[PDB]
Structure 1
Amino acid sequence: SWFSLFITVTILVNCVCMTRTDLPEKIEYVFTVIYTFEALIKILARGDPWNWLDFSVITLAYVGTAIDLRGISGLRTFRVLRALKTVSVIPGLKVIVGALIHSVKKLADVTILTIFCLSVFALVGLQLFKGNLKNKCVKNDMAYSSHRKPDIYINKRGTSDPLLCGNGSDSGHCPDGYICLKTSDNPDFNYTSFDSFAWAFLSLFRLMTQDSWERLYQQTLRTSGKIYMIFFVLVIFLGSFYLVNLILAVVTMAYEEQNQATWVKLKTILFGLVTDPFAELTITLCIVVNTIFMAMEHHGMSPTFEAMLQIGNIVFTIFFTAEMVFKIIAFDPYYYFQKKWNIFDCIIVTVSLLELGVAKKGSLSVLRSFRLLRVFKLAKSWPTLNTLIKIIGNSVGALGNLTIILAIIVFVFALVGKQLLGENYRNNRKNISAPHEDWPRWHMHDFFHSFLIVFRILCGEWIENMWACMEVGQKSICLILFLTVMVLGNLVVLNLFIALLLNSFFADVGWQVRKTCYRIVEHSWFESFIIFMILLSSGSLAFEDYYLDQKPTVKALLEYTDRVFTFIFVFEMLLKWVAYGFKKYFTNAWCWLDFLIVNISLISLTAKILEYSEVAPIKALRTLRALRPLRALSRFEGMRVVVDALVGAIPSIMNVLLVCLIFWLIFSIMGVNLFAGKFWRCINYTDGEFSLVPLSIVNNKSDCKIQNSTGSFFWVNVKVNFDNVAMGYLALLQVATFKGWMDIMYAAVDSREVNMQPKWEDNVYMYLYFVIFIIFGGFFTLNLFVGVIIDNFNQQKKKLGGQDIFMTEEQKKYYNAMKKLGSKKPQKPIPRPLNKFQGFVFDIVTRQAFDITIMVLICLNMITMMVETDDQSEEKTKILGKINQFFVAVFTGECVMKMFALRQYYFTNGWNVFDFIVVVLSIASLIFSAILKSLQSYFSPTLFRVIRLARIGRILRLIRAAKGIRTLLFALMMSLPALFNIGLLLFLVMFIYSIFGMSSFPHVRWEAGIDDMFNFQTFANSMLCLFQITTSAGWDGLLSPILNTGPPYCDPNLPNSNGTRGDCGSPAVGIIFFTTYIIISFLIMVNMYIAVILENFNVA
C-alpha cells in the first residue's frame, strides 16, 4: 500500500497548497520541488477526458514554473483549477455532477425562449427609450461657442447622482432656473442605457432577474413619463415571473426523474431512574419562561431590570444543571451518553456553567445566545419543528454532496476573483469609493470580501458590484466572472432547494311581502345594479387625494354621492333582512362583512352630521372606508374561488408562521445581544444631505455635544435597528427580503461599544452573523414554508376530487375546449388549383424552401434592426430606412402571393391571418409616418417611436418555427385564466392599500424612496409605488421616510400641514402597512407559481 500512501499524500499536499489563500508570499516556491518530484514517478511506473486535462496540467505547470521574470498572476489559475481533483476523489460528487450537466441539457428549450424574449423586449426598449437616460437638469446661462462653461447640474436630494429630467407632461420637471437638456453621458457609470442592442439587452437581463430593477424603473419613468410603466408591468410579468417558473419547472422534472429511476446509592439511583411525566412538563415551562425572559432585554434597561434578568438566568441555569445531575445519577453515563438529545443538553448546560465562571460584560455574546439552543428541545411534541430539524439534517446528510459542491463553487470563484481582480481594486480604489470614504465596501483585495461578493451575488445582487469592478479593472474578466458565478451558483442553489423539498416532505301579509322581497333580491337586474353601485362607490375613493381640498365642487359632489350610496346599501341590507331572514343572514360569512362595512359608513355619517368628526376614534374609523371595495369579492365568482383557496390553506400557514417566529426569535435575541444600542451616530445635516462625521472630531456622544458649534450636529440612530426584539424582527425581515439590509450590515460592521462613533469596518466578522442568518433562517425556513404550502395544496386538490382550483366552471369549459384545440394534428391539405397560372404560385409557395428562405429573411431583418443605435448619423438612418422599405416590400409581396394562390383557405389557419395583421400594420405604420412627418402636423417625436413598434411583429413571426417555444407559450395561454382571477385579487388588494396609503401616508418628507413622482399624493403615484413593492423591490425606501419622528429629518412643527402637524410619518402604521402587504403579495405569488407549474406538468 506504499503506492497508495504515495498517491494519497500528494493529493493532500496539493489540496493544502491552494488553501493557502492569504496575501503574504513568505513560503510559495518550495512546493515546486514536490511538484517535480511527484511528476516524474507516475510515468516510469507504467502499471478519461478529465484525466487527459489532468496530465496536461502538470506539463503546463512545469512550463509556468521554469523562469518567472514577469508574473501576471495567471499562473495561479491553473493550480486553482487543480483543486477539482478532490471533486472526483470523493465518490459522491461524480453522480451529482453528472445529474447537474443533465439538468443543463434539458434547460436548452427554456434558454432559447428566454433569449428570444430578452431580445424582443430589448428591441422594444431600444426603440422606445433610446437616449432617454441622457437627459439631465442643466442650469441655464446668464448671457457663445458650442461648449459654454461646463454644464453644471443639480444633485438629486439624498444622493450624488445628477437629477434626471424630461420635457413630457408626466415625465419630471427641473426647479426654477434649470432646463431639460440631453447630455452626453449615462446615469450610473455610463453603463445603464437603452442606446444600443447590447446595453438594452443588459438592462432587460437585469430586469428579468429583478436585481435592483427599481432604479431602472424610476429612471426611465422620470425620463420618459409615467405612462411607460406598462412596459415594466409586461416585462416583470412575462420576463421575470414566467421564465423563472419555466426554470423552476424544468429543474423539477429533471431532478425528480433521477431518483424515480433509482447498598445506599442503588435505592437512590432507582428512585431517580423512575421519572414522572409531570417532570418534563416543568422542563418545558422553565424553558419557555427562560426564553420569554431573554426576549425582554433592551437598550434602555433599568438596573433593577438587568438584575431581574441576571437572577432569572442563574435560577434557570442551576435548574437545568440539577436536571442533568439527577438524570446522570438516574441512568448510567454509559447509557445516558448514548441518546442523541442528552449529549446536546449536556453540552448546552456546561457552556452555561463555563460562562458563569467567566462572566465579563461582552465576553462571547454569541455564546451567551447558546442557551437559546434548548428551544429545539420542544420538538418531541411539536412535529413541524421536528420536520425543520430533519430538513437541516438532510442538508448535510442524504444531500451532503450538493452542499459540498456548492461550497467548492463558492470557494473557487472567490479565490479566482481575488487572484485576478485583487490588485486592481486596491490601486484604482479611488473611483469606486464613496464620496467621503476611502475604500469600497465590497471588493476583492482579500479572500473574505471576495467571498462576501460571491455570497451577495448568490443572494441576487450582482450588477452594482459588476459596475464597480468594470470601473476598477478589465471589463472582459468582470463580465465572465460575474455572469458565470450568477448562473452557476443560482443553478446549484435552486437544485439544492428542490432536492431538499422533494425527499424531505414527500418521503299573511308579512309573509307575502317577504315572498315578493325574495323575488326582488334574487332578480338579475337587482344584482347587476348592486354590483354597479359597488364599482362606483369604490371608484369614488380614488378621488380623495392631496388636491381634493383645492377642488371645491367635486368635494361636495363626492359628499352627496357617498351619502346616496350609503343610503342605498342600508336599503339593500334591509331587503336582505326582510327576504333571507335573520338567522341565515348572520350565518353567511359574507353578509357579515357587508353589514360591518355599512356599519362603519353609518357611524361615520351620523358622527359627521353630529359635530364629533374630529375626535380620534371617529377620525380613525373614517380611514376604514378603504375597506369598501371588499364588497366585490362576494359578487365575482373568480375572486370568491381564490379567497376560498386562500382560506383553506390559512391553518397550516399559521403553524409554519409560528415556527418561523420562534426561529427568528432566537436569531433576533442573538442580534439584540450583539448589536443593541450600538447603531447611533453623528451626522452633519445641512440641507437634505448628511455626512458621517469623521472620527478625527468626535468619536463620542459627548464630543458631538461640544462640537455642535454650527448647530448642525445630531446624535441619530439607524432607522431599522436592533434595540428590541420587535425591532429585531423588522431588521431580520429586511435582511431576509434582501431590501434595506445594506444599511444594517454597514452599521453592524462599523459598530463599537456603546456611545462612540462607528469606525470603518471595525467588526468585519459580524458579516458572518448575517451570512448564518440567511443560510438558516431564510433558506431552510422558505424551504419549510414552500413544502407545507405544496402539501396543503395537494390536500385541497385531492379533497375536491383532483380538480383544478382557481378556475370558474365557465373558465373550466374554456380550459377543456382550448386543450382540445392544441391536439388536433391532421388538416386535410387543401385542393390543388386547376388553372395552370393559379397553379404556378401554389406549387411554388407550398414547398418548404419558400418558408425557409422567408425565415432567413426575417432573421436578416431582425439583424438590421439590431444595429440601430442612438446618435448614429444621418446616412445610417437613411440607409436603414431604405432597407426597411425593401423588407416591407418583400413581405407585402409574399402576402399578395399567398393570398392569390390560397383564395379562401388562407385565413382558415391562424398563422396566416396573424401574418396579414403584421403586414397591414407595417404598411399602415409606413404610410402614417410618411403623412405625419414634418410635411403635416408636428406632434411630439415620441409618437414616431411608438408608431415604429409595428415591425416587432415580423420578429414575432418566428414563433411558428420553434416547437419548444410554441409549446411553452401554449402552457402560458392555458394557464392564463387562473392567473386572471389571481391578478384580479391582487389588483383589489393593491387598490385597497392604495387608498389606505393615499389617506395614511401623503404628508411625508421627500426622501430615499419618496419623491415628487413616487409618493402617496395621487392615485397614480400610489399605484406606481405599490406595483414597485409588489415584488418587494425597494419597500425599505418607502418605509424609511415614514419611520421619521422629528428633527433633523422631519419638522414636527409645520403650520401649512393638517395631519401630523409636520412631515413625521407614523412609524406604527407604517410598519403594519408595508410589512403586511409584502407577505400577502408573497402569499399570492406562491399560488400563482403553483398555478403556472401544474399546467406545465399537464403539458409535459
Structure 2
Amino acid sequence: HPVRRAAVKILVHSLFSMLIMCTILTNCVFMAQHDPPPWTKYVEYTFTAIYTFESLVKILARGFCLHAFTFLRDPWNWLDFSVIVMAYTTEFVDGNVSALRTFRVLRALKTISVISGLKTIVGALIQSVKKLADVMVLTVFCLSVFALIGLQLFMGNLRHKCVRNFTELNGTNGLVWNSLDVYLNDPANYLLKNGTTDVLLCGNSSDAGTCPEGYRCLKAGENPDHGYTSFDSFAWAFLALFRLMTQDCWERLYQQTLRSAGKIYMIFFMLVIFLGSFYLVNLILAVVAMAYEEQNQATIAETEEKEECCPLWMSIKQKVKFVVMDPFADLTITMCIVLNTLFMALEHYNMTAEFEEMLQVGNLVFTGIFTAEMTFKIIALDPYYYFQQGWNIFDSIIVILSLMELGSVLRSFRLLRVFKLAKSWPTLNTLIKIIGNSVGALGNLTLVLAIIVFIFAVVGMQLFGKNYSELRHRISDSGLLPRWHMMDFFHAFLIIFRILCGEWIETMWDCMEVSGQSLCLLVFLLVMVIGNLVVLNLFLALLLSSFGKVWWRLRKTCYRIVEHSWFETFIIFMILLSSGALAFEDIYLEERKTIKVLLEYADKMFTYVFVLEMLLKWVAYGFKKYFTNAWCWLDFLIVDVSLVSLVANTLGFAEMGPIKSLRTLRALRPLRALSRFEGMRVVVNALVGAIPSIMNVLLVCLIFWLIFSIMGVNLFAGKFGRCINQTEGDLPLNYTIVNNKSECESFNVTGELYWTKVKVNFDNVGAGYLALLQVATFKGWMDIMYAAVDSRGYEEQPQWEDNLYMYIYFVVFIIFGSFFTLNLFIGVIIDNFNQQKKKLGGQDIFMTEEQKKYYNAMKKLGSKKPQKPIPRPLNKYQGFIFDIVTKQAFDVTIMFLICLNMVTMMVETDDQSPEKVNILAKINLLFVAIFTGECIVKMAALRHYYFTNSWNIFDFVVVILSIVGTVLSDIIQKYFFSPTLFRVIRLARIGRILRLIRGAKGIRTLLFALMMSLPALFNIGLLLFLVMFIYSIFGMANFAYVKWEAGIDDMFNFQTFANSMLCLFQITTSAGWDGLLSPILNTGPPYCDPNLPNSNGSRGNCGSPAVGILFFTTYIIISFLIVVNMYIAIILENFSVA
C-alpha cells in the first residue's frame, strides 16, 4: 500500500531521526524552565504534535492492529506510548492537583532510543546491576547486622543533651515549667555547642563529653540535627549505617556518637569503617569491574571473530628553505614553554607595579618568540603541514589567540601553551588519552550520565520548587534563600552534582525538612544508587581502556650475638618500650612529676642501648655490609639525631631554637619498627617500590592543577577577603554597610571591623594548590565555593550570589581533576601493583612467608567432597526423626523461623513500653526454645551431627550461649543488676542472625573472600597504625594547644594520645580534614592569640601553617595510597576466589 510504503520510508530515513532529536532537545530546554510564560503552552502542543506524528509514522510503518502490537513489542516504544497518552490526558482532563505535569521528563529518555549507541550503553549498564545482586544482598545484610548492633548499643543514646540543672519543689507537680512538659519544649535553655548552632551532647561514662558547671545531662530531648540521625528505631539505624557505608559526612555521626556514649566505641566505628564501609564499597568496585571485564572480553571477543613576483618569490622560497632547513630546537622552545608556565605562575594577590610591568614585558617577549617559531617553521618546510598536522594547528591557534588577546576570563588562552609538553611525556600522553576517551569511545556513556543528571535535576526542581520557595524559612538560619535549593535549574543541577560527588545526606535533610520524607528519600536514594553506579561504570571503563687473632675472636663473638634471636627480641621490646615512652609525652607531664624523670632516664637508656647495638653492628658487619642496607641507614640517621640532641643537652647550648627544635624529630623513633617486623617490611617494599610511578603521575597532576590554579589566580585573587565584623563572625552586614576594603579601612574607627581572607583561598599558586586539593578531595570545599560564587569585585565585599555562574569553574575542575586525575592515579597505581605481582611471579603481595602458608591452607579449606554422606542410625525412632530432619525442607523451615526471629529483633526501639518488653521477652523465649529443639534433635540425628561440620558446631555454641543468655537475663534481679552489663548479654543475640550465612551462597563467598584478605589487610593496617602513631606523636608535640575551632573540639584534640589517635582515625578516611586544618592555618589575631600562657613553656595557641599543611597533605597522600593498597588486596582476593 502507498501509505505503508511512505511510512516505512519515513521510518527508515536518516533525517527524521535528526528531526526527533532536535525536537527532544528543544523540549528539554523548554522543560528546564521554572514558571514558564503562558506563551509556551502552544509550544507544548507543537511538541505533542511532533511526538504523536512520529508514533503514527511508526504504527503505520507497521500498518495493522497486529503491527501496532509489534510496534509495542519494542520495550523502548512503551515509553513513547505512555508519554503520548500522558500528554493527551494532561490536556484532556486535569480536585485538581496537577502533579502529573512532571511526567514529561520521560521524554528526555527518548534520546536513548533515538541515538544509535545510547541504548546499547544503557543495556550494557543494566547487566552490571544484575551482577551486583549478591553484593547488594550482602550489603543490606551487613547494614542490618551492624544496624542491630548499633541499635542495641546506642538505643536513643544520641538524644543526650546538656540541660541546665533540674529545680524540684515539693509543692505542685525562673522555673514556671513542669518537668517533662517544660524540658522537651525547653531547647533555648539547652546548651549550644560553641561556635555552632547545634545541641551539645553528653554522657554519664567517664569518656563522653564533660558538661560545664551548671549543666547536667539527661536522655530527655528531641533528637540531633533534624531528627534523622537518631540510632533508635532500627529504620533510622539502617539509615545512619547506610550513611556510614557511603561515608557521606560520617565524621559528624562519629563525633556525635563518641560525644554521647563514650570514646571507647571508636572500636565500633572503626570496625564499620574498615570492614563495612571500605570493604563493601571496594567489593561493589570489584564486581562492577568484573562484569565490565566480561563484557569487554565478550564484546572484544565477538568483534575478533569475523569471517611580489613569481621568480623572486620562488627563489626566495627555495633560499629560505635552505637557510632554515633544520630547526631541531624543540628543547629550546620547550624550555621557553616551561619558562612561560613559570612566568605566568609568578602571579599573586598584591603584585608590585614594577613586578606586573615585568610580567607584561615577558608576556610580549614570549608572544613574539612563539610567533617567530610559528613563522619560521611555516616558511621552513611546508605550509601544507601547518594545514594538516593538528599539532601545528593548535600551535597556530594559540599564536593567533595570544595576538587577539594582546589586541577575568581574559588570560584563559595563554594557559593553552602548557599542554604541548605532552608530546614527549608518556604519562601526560596517557592523561591526554584518558581525557580524549572521555568524549570518544566512552562518549556514549558520558551521554548516559549527562542525560541522567538532567532528568533528575528537572524532576527534583518541579517536584520540590514550590516547597523550597514557600517553606524556605524551615531550611535556612536567617531569612534568606538556601545555599543549596532546587527552585531554579542551575541549583537543581548543582544538587544532583553534589549527590554525584558523594555528599547526599546533608541536603536530603533539607529536602525532607521542606518537602516530605517519603518521596524525598525516594528520589535522593534513587539518584544516589543510579548516579553513583553510572559514575562507577564510567570510571572503570576509562581505567580499563587506559591500557691480631683477638680481632677474629671479638668479631666472631659479635656475629654470634647479633644472629642470636634473644638479642633481636631484646631490641624489639626495646623499641616497643621507646615508642611507648613517646606515647606518654602529652600535655599532662607537668602534673606527672615522677614519670617526667622516669622517662628522662628512659630516654638516656634508650639512646645508650641503641648506639651500643649500633657499635656492635659496626664492629661486626663491616662498613660495607652495614651501609648496603637502607634500614641500617634509617637506624643510623635516627641514632644520629638522638645523639646530637643528647650531646647538645649535656654540653650546654641547648633549649633555644635549634637545638631542641630538632627533638620533635625524635617522633620518628617508631620508624625502627619497619625494619624488624616481617609485615611492615614487605608492605613498605611494596609501597616505595612504586615511587617512580607515583612521582610521575603526581608531576602530571601538578602540571594540570597548575593550569587550574593559575586560572584560579586570574579569576579569584583578593576577591575572597570578606571584612566580617567582630561580634558575629560572619560576612559584614550587607554590601552597602562595607562594600570595599578601602571602606572597611575607613569604617574601622572602632577596632570592631576586620578585613580577613578565608583560610584556604586562591591568592598564589601555593594556596591555589591547597584550595584545589581541598575541592578535588571534597572535604572543605563548601567554603571555597561559597566564597568564590560570592566573589563580586577585586577587593569589594561579596554579595550573596553575584558571579553565580562560577560554580561552573569548580564543576569543570572537579570533573577534570578528580574524576580524571584520581582516575590516572588509581589506574597507574593499580597497574603498577599488577606488574609487581607478575614480576614476582608469585603473584601475591603484602603477605610474608608464613602468611603465604596461611593463605594456601585457607584456600584448601574450601574442600568440596564431603565424608561418608550420612549414616542411617539403624534405629526405628531415630530413623524416623532423622528422616524428618535430614530433608532439605527442614533447613528451609528453620531458615524462615530464624528470619522471623531477625524481624522480631528489628522491632524494638527505646522506651518502647513495658508490655512490649514482656511480649518481646516471651517471643525470645519461644525462639530460643525452638532453637534448643532443633539443637537436641540434630544432636540426636545419629550421633555426630553436632560435630561433623563447622556450621553445626557454630549452631551448637550459639544455642548454648542463647540458653545461658536467657537464664542469666531472668535472674538479673536476684544477684545484681547493671545498666551496661545487660547490654552485652543482650547483644550476643546477633549470633543467631549469623546463622543465615549457611543457606546463603553469595554472602558466604564474599565473606570468605574478606576472610582470605584479612592477613594482607592486617599487615597493611599494621603499617597504617604505625603511621597513625608517628603522626599522632608529631602532632601531639606540635599541634597541641591550638585554638578550638571547627574540627578540634574539647573531646577531639591533639592534646592527649587518645584524642590524637582518634582525630587521625577520622583523617585516615580523608574525612573532616578540612575541619582539622582550619585551626592550624590561622596565624595571628583576630582568631588566635599569639603569645598566651600554655601548660608547657612554649607560647601561643595558633598553629603553624607551614607545618600544618605539610602534616595534613602528606597524611592524606599516604593514607590514600595505603587504602589504595586496601582496594588492591580486596580486588585481587575477590577475583581469585570467585
Name the TM-score class by shorter chain.
Answer: over 0.9
Report 1:960-999 matches (<5 A).
960-999=998-1037
State the SS of the aligned residue for 1:1049.
Answer: coil
The 8 Å contact of residues 270 and 330 in structure 1, kept in 2 or not, is answered as no
2:304 pairs with 1:279: no
Q: 1:1074 to 1:829 in 2, by over 3 A?
A: same
- 8 Å CA contact retained: 1:206, 1:213: yes
For residues 95 and 250 of structure 2, the distance between their equivalents in structure 1, rounded to whole angstroms, comes to 47
Counterparts of 1:1032-1071 in structure 2, within 5 Å, are 1032-1056=1070-1094, 1058=1096, 1061-1071=1099-1109
More displaced, 118-127 or 821-830?
821-830
User: Which structure 2 residue ranges, 5 or more long, are not aligned?
Assistant: 1-8, 64-73, 303-310
Matched, 1:1072 2:1110: yes
1:342 pairs with one of 378, 387, 392: 392
Match runs of 1:320-359 below 5 Å = 320-331=370-381, 333-357=383-407
Change (3 A) 1:524 1:575: same
CA–CA separation in structure 1 for the residues paired with 2:319 and 2:963: 98
1:817-896 equivalent positions in 2, closer than 5 A: 817-896=857-936
Q: Taking structure 1 as reference, are residues 312 and 168 closer, same or farther at Cα in structure 2, changes over 3 Å only? A: same
2:496 to 446, 451, 454: 454
* Matched positions, count: 1086
State the one-letter code of the partner of 1:412: I
Structure 1 residue 999 displacement after superposition: 0.5
1:252 maps to amino acid:
A
| Residues 620 and 104 of structure 1, relative CA distance in 2, 3 Å threshold | same
Measured after TM superposition, the shift of residue 6 of structure 1 is: 6.0
2: CA distance, partners of 1:706 / 1:398:
59
Report if aligned partners of 1:671, 1:728 keep a CA contact under 8 Å in 2.
Answer: yes
2:448 corresponds, among 399, 405, 416, to 405
Does residue 30 of the first structure (1) align with residue 42 of the second (2)?
A: yes
| Pairing 1:807–2:857 present | no
Alpha-carbon distance in structure 2 between the residues aligned to 1:37 and 1:718: 53
Q: Does structure 1 conserve the Cα–Cα contact (< 8 Å) formed by 2:938 and 2:945?
A: no
1:571-608: per-residue Cα shift (whole Å, max 9, x none)?
Answer: 11111112112221122111111111111111122222
Residue 568 of structure 2 corresponds to which residue in structure 1? 527
Change (3 A) 1:269 1:500: farther
For residues 405 and 97 of structure 2, what CA distance do their matches in structure 1 show? 51
SS in 1 for 2:216: strand
CA distance in 1, matches of 2:315, 2:237: 83
Q: What SS does the aligned partner of 2:675 have?
A: coil
Find 1:18's aligned residue among 23, 28, 45. 28
* SS, match of residue 825 in structure 1: coil
Q: Which moved more, 1:385-394 or 1:1054-1063?
A: 1054-1063
1:319 aligns with 2:361: no
| Counterpart pick for 1:606 among 643, 647, 650 | 647
Q: 1:709 to 1:2 in 2, by over 3 A?
A: same
SS of alignment partner, residue 138 of structure 1: strand
Contact 1:74-1:420 within 8 A present in 2 as well: no
Q: Verify: 1:592 aligned to 2:633, yes or no.
A: yes
CA-to-aligned-CA distance 1:980-1016 (integer Å, 9 cap, x gap)? 1111111111111111011001111111000111001
Task: Provide the aligned C-alpha RMSD in A.
Answer: 2.0
Q: What's the CA shift for 1:905?
A: 4.9
* Partner deviation per Cα, 1:116-161 (whole Å, 9 max, x = no partner): 1011111111111111111111112566533347531121111111
Task: Please show how residues 493-508 of structure 1 align to structure 2 within 5 Å.
Answer: 493-505=535-547, 508=549
Structure 1 equivalent of residue 75 of structure 2: 49
Please state whether the residue corresponding to 1:179 is helix, strand or coil: strand
Query: What SS does structure 1 have at the residue aligned with 2:633?
Result: helix
Question: SS at 2:676's partner residue?
Answer: coil
What residue identity is the alignment partner of 2:846? F
Contact map agreement 2:435 2:820 (CA 8 A) in 1: yes
Name the residue aligned to 2:976.
937
Q: Does residue 98 of the first structure (1) align with residue 123 of the second (2)?
A: yes
Q: Are the structure 2 counterparts of residues 9 and 659 from structure 1 closer, same or farther at C-alpha, using a change threshold of 3 Å?
A: closer
Q: C-alpha deviations, 1:751-808, integer Å up to 9, x for none?
A: 1223321110111111011111111121111122122212222221222224311111
| Alignment pair present for 1:776 and 2:812 | no
Matched letter for residue 413 of structure 1: F
1:275, distance to aligned residue in structure 2 (A) = 4.1
- Aligned equivalent of 1:1021, options 1059, 1067, 1070: 1059
Kindly state the Cα deviation for residue 324 of structure 1 after the two structures are TM-superposed: 2.2
- 1:378 is aligned, of 416, 421, 427, to 421
The more displaced of 725-734 and 245-254 is 245-254
Q: How many angstroms does 1:554 deviate by? A: 1.0
Instruction: Indicate yes or no: 2:600 matched with 1:559.
Output: yes
Determine helix, strand or coil for the equivalent of 1:616.
coil
Cα separation, 2, equivalents of 1:318 and 1:1074 = 43
Change (3 A) 1:38 1:217: closer
Q: Give the drift of 1:33.
A: 4.2
State the Cα distance separating 1:838 from its structure 2 match: 4.0
Tell me, yes or no, if structure 1 residue 787 matches structure 2 residue 827. yes
Tell me whether 886-895 or 421-430 shows the greater mean CA deviation. 886-895
Give the residue type in structure 2 aligned to 1:496.
L
Measure how far apart 1:968 and its partner are: 1.0
Deviations 1:690-743 (A, max 9, x none): 564333422233443454466432211100011110110010000011000100
Closer/same/farther in 2, CA of residues 206 and 148 from structure 1, 3 Å limit: closer
SS of the aligned residue for 1:826 comes to: coil
State the 1:31 CA deviation. 2.9
Residue of 801, 805, 808 corresponding to 1:765: 805
Q: Secondary structure at the match of 1:599?
A: helix
Assess, with a 3 A threshold, how the Cα gap between structure 1 residues 1037 and 38 changes in structure 2: closer, same or farther.
closer
Partner of 1:469: 511
Gaps of 5+ in 1: 358-364
Instruction: Answer yes or no: is the 8 Å Cα contact 2:945–2:952 preserved in 1.
Output: no
Q: How does 1:951-966 map to 2 (within 5 A)?
A: 951-966=989-1004
Counterparts in 2 of 1:886 and 1:69: CA distance versus 1, 3 Å? closer
Residue range with higher mean Cα deviation, 34-43 or 726-735 = 34-43
Aligned with 2:40: secondary structure? coil
- Check 1:1059–1:311 CA distance in 2 against 1; reply closer, same or farther (3 A cut): farther
SS at match of 2:1059: helix
Partner of 1:362: none
SS in 2 for 1:1015: coil
SS in 2 for 1:713: coil
Q: Does 1:442 align with 2:484?
A: yes
Structure-1-length-normalised TM-score: 0.96
Letter aligned with residue 87 of structure 1 = I
Write the letter of the residue equivalent to 1:327.
K
Matches within 5 A, 1:629-708: 629-686=670-727, 690=730, 692-708=732-748
SS in 2 for 1:337: helix
- TM-score, structure 2 normalization: 0.93
- Structure 2: distance between partners of 1:1041 and 1:570: 39
- Which moved further from structure 2: 1076-1085 or 259-268? 259-268
Q: In the alignment, is residue 946 of structure 1 matched against residue 989 of structure 2?
A: no
SS in 1 for 2:218: strand
Moved more, 119-128 or 573-582: 573-582
Counterpart for residue 269 of structure 2: 232
d(CA) in 2 for partners of 1:951 and 1:69? Answer: 52
- Contact map agreement 1:1030 1:1081 (CA 8 A) in 2: yes
Report percent identity of matched pairs. Answer: 74
- 1:764–1:575: structure 2 CA closer, same or farther, 3 Å change rule? same
Aligned to 1:156: 193
Shift of 1:1056: 4.1
Q: Please report how far the alpha carbon of residue 1059 of structure 1 lies from its aligned counterpart in structure 2 after TM superposition.
A: 5.6
1:834 partner SS: coil
Conserved 8 A contact 1:157-1:1007: no
Aligned: 1:213 with 2:215: no
Aligned equivalents of 2:881, 2:434: Cα separation in 1: 66
Distance in 2 (CA, whole Å) between partners of 1:551 and 1:991 is 22
The residue type equivalent to 2:134 in the other structure is D
Contact 1:73/1:419 (<8 A) preserved: no
The Cα of 1:934 is off from its aligned counterpart by: 4.4
CA distance in 1, matches of 2:653, 2:944: 74
Higher mean C-alpha deviation, range 644-653 or range 885-894? 885-894
